[PDB]
Amino acid sequence: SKVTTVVATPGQGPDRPQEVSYTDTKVIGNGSFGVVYQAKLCDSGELVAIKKVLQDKRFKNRELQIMRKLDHCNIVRLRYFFYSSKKDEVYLNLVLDYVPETVYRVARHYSRAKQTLPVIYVKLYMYQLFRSLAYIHSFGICHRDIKPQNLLLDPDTAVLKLCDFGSAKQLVRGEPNVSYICSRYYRAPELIFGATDYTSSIDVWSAGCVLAELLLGQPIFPGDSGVDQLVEIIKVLGTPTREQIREMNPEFKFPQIKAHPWTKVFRPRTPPEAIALCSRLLEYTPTARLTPLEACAHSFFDELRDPNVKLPNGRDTPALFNFTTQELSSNPPLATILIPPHARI
Amino acid sequence: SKVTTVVATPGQGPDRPQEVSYTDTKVIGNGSFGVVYQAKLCDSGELVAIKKVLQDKRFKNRELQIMRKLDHCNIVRLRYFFYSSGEKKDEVYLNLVLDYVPETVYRVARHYSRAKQTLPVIYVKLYMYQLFRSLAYIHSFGICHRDIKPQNLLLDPDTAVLKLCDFGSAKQLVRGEPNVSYICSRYYRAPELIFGATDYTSSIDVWSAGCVLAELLLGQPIFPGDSGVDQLVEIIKVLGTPTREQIREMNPEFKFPAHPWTKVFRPRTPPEAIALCSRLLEYTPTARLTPLEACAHSFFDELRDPNVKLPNGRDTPALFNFTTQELSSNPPLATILIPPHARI
Ligand SMILES: COc1ccc(CNC(=O)Nc2ncc([N+](=O)[O-])s2)cc1
Ligand SMILES: COc1ccc(CNC(=O)Nc2ncc([N+](=O)[O-])s2)cc1
Numbered sequence: 001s002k003v004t005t006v007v008a009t010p011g012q013g014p015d016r017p018q019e020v021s022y023t024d025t026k027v028i029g030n031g032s033f034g035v036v037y038q039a040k041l042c043d044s045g046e047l048v049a050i051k052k053v054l055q056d057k058r059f060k061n062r063e064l065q066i067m068r069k070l071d072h073c074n075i076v077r078l079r080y081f082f083y084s085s086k087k088d089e090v091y092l093n094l095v096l097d098y099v100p101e102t103v104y105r106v107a108r109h110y111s112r113a114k115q116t117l118p119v120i121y122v123k124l125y126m127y128q129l130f131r132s133l134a135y136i137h138s139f140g141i142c143h144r145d146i147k148p149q150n151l152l153l154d155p156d157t158a159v160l161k162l163c164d165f166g167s168a169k170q171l172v173r174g175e176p177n178v179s180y181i182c183s184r185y186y187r188a189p190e191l192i193f194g195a196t197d198y199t200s201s202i203d204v205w206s207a208g209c210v211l212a213e214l215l216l217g218q219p220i221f222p223g224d225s226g227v228d229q230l231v232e233i234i235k236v237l238g239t240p241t242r243e244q245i246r247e248m249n250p251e252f253k254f255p256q257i258k259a260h261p262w263t264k265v266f267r268p269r270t271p272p273e274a275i276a277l278c279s280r281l282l283e284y285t286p287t288a289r290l291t292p293l294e295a296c297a298h299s300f301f302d303e304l305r306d307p308n309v310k311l312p313n314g315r316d317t318p319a320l321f322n323f324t325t326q327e328l329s330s331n332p333p334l335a336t337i338l339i340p341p342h343a344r345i
Numbered sequence: 346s347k348v349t350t351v352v353a354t355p356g357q358g359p360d361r362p363q364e365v366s367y368t369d370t371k372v373i374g375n376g377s378f379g380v381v382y383q384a385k386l387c388d389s390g391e392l393v394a395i396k397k398v399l400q401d402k403r404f405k406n407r408e409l410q411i412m413r414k415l416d417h418c419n420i421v422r423l424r425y426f427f428y429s430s431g432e433k434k435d436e437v438y439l440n441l442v443l444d445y446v447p448e449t450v451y452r453v454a455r456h457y458s459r460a461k462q463t464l465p466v467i468y469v470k471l472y473m474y475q476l477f478r479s480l481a482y483i484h485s486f487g488i489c490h491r492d493i494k495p496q497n498l499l500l501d502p503d504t505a506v507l508k509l510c511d512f513g514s515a516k517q518l519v520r521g522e523p524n525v526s527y528i529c530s531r532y533y534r535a536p537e538l539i540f541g542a543t544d545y546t547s548s549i550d551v552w553s554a555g556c557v558l559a560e561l562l563l564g565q566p567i568f569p570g571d572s573g574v575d576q577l578v579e580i581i582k583v584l585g586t587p588t589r590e591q592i593r594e595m596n597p598e599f600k601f602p603a604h605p606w607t608k609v610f611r612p613r614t615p616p617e618a619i620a621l622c623s624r625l626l627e628y629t630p631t632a633r634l635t636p637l638e639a640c641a642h643s644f645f646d647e648l649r650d651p652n653v654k655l656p657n658g659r660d661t662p663a664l665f666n667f668t669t670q671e672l673s674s675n676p677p678l679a680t681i682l683i684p685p686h687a688r689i
Contacts, residue, residue, distance in 0.1 A: 031575075032570060032574070032575040032578040033578065033602065053602070054602055055602075056602065059600075145572065147571075167572075167574060176598070178574075178598070178599050179541055179573075180539050180540065180541065180572070180573025180574060180577070181572060181573065181574055182572055183571040183572045184531055184571055184572065192527050193527065194526055194527065194541045194543075196541075223377065224494075224530035224531055225492065225514075225527065225528060225529055225531065226525075226527025226528065227377070227514065227525075227527060227528055228376075228377040228530075230527070231377035231378075232377065251523060251524075251525060253401075253404070253407075255399055255401060256401070256403075
């Protein structure tokens with residue numbers, strides 16, 4: 001069909017634009033900040049995603065600037081970017097790697113089939129999500145919108161890639177940040193309470209909500225309003241001590257409810273390690289939550305470090321131990337756990 | 346079948362306990378706060394709703410205290426209230442016996458939406474008008490509902506009567522006193538709440554009502570979004586970017602990267618309906634119409650017509666028996682609100 005040719009700038013390396021042609025354009029999803037398309041590169045035949053957002057000439061696009069700096073196996077790669085044109089309006093086009101599925105779509109499949117995602121996949125997906133967070137957090141960048149829809153999945157290789165950096169921002173201690181980011185169901189308590197001094201740990205809470213959801217087969221803290229969502233949290237974590245509330249946001253009345261034993265939250269067959277990890281991610285006190293790197297090192301992921309592990313389709317697991325110094329910067333000693341004896345010999 | 350008899354306190358008037366018996370109990374809908382049941386009064390066979398919530402031993406229920414003060418045709422009435430148990434040896438439960446209403450705007454609107462149809466404008470007028478009366482009334486006492494949404498608007502299919510319910514988030518707003526900004530359900534939250542304001546006023550209810558009006562006219566929520574950011578984008582598309590001063594009026598803070606109003610609704614949408622929406626959904630809280638002013642809007646002129654009738658041929662509900670209390674915010678408006686024929 002129609003062949004579109006543009007002069008695009010490579011995502012990484014020096015700003016040296018090159019002519020790029022693509023075709024077979026289709027809509028993948030319509031988001032508030034723009035539309036995402038699927039296209040095929042005439043050159044290689046590779047499929048790519050093109051995120052198109054309205055861009056005003058007076059100020060640089062933050063998502064673009066953040067993506068040009070990222071380079072990690074568990075984060076969607078920015079291949080190129082370019083501008084296009086009703087008319088007086090200019091659009092920034094982000095050419096990203098295209099990934100077939102999302103955790104949202106896959107989980108929905110199981111949910112509908114009255115089944116739950118096999119735990120091996122929960123381990124694979126969550127471990128990789130934590131690696132992506134360890135990486136961006138090492139640069140002080142907080143995603144701020146971790147949710148199933150932003151977790152891309154390749155069904156064949158079991159590779160997970162974090163996407164949509166439209167809400168991402170470098171968090172600088174002392175500088176206020178809007179509390180209205182992050183999607184409902186996945187918002188950390190401090191955000192619901194209106195904190196503007198939150199840290200990257202809000203990504204860890206969101207991650208914990210995703211893990212819980214994959215184990216449960218449905219969101220763990222649903223609610224149409226903040227109040228409702230907080231009630232669901234309280235029912236599991238128990239009523240927050242005024243100390244913990246202080247930890248979240250430096251004035252409401254909540255029902256005094258005693259913590260619900262995490263073991264009774266999930267079905268009987270739920271692995272003990274999964275429940276334990278959840279409880280260490282979903283904590284009221286932000287600073288008490290595990291860091292992404294610490295989560296990766298958790299016992300729940302031990303099976304991934306077993307030399308004989310294989311994917312259900314018979315293929316070998318994706319790369320899981322190619323850690324860089326940057327990625328391990330928050331706690332280098334964890335390398336002795338994260339990189340097993342058999343890895344990268 | 347099973348008959349339950351309890352001794353309850355009247356919702357209003359002297360505290361003369363009354364023996365109440367009901368049967369055929371069934372869940373109407375659960376909810377973070379408390380479960381709501383449907384039950385039938387033994388003698389009269391009349392149906393009622395029973396809202397059961399855990400009784401907090403330290404303080405008295407705020408919903409109860411507020412409900413005991415209300416008496417209005419467009420607000421569900423608290424007939425009685427009593428205590429008991431229901432789940433586990435200790436915890437006490439507060440039971441609010443309320444008037445039962447057949448439908449909700451949520452349920453009715455969904456039926457039309459599924460059939461790709463929209464509620465006839467005459468009903469939109471009647472429902473929204475009664476909603477605004479209920480707000481004028483509670484606001485006259487300084488009480489803000491804080492959770493106006495289709496699910497909390499009860500409807501009687503036959504009489505076209507609308508009643509506001511669920512005062513679980515309602516609160517007396519006092520100038521100078523902070524209030525949590527995490528109340529109100531997604532889609533219906535005023536911009537100032539999204540921005541985290543804690544000094545908001547009863548006008549957040551007007552914004553929510555505006556969202557319901559727009560939704561009934563459109564066939565779907567007007568400002569959808571899974572995050573506050575997304576919601577703000579939808580709002581910006583319609584209202585345009587907020588001036589830095591408008592931002593100041595909303596929340597005494599970052600950035601944002603095109604639908605007028607006459608391009609939002611279907612072709613034959615009444616002009617007055619669009620005008621009303623634009624005056625309810627304003628960034629500057631103080632710029633929004635008050636509930637009483639909304640009732641007086643031209644969109645509701647047809648309701649003041651002497652010959653107006655419901656589609657089923659019945660007369661409309663009583664729409665002009667305003668009390669001094671209801672008009673207190675602006676007595677002079679009664680010259681518009683009360684039609685000539687109503688003064689005969
Ligand atoms: C039928 O259209 C589709 C096709 C694929 C999907 C799920 N697959 C995807 O969303 N893949 C994506 N890759 C990269 C993205 N990005 O924005 O950076 S989105 C959903 C709908
Ligand atoms: C099938 O059970 C039902 C029956 C009716 C409905 C809709 N009708 C209602 O909810 N009516 C209500 N009346 C009073 C209420 N209150 O809380 O004060 S809720 C929903 C479910």
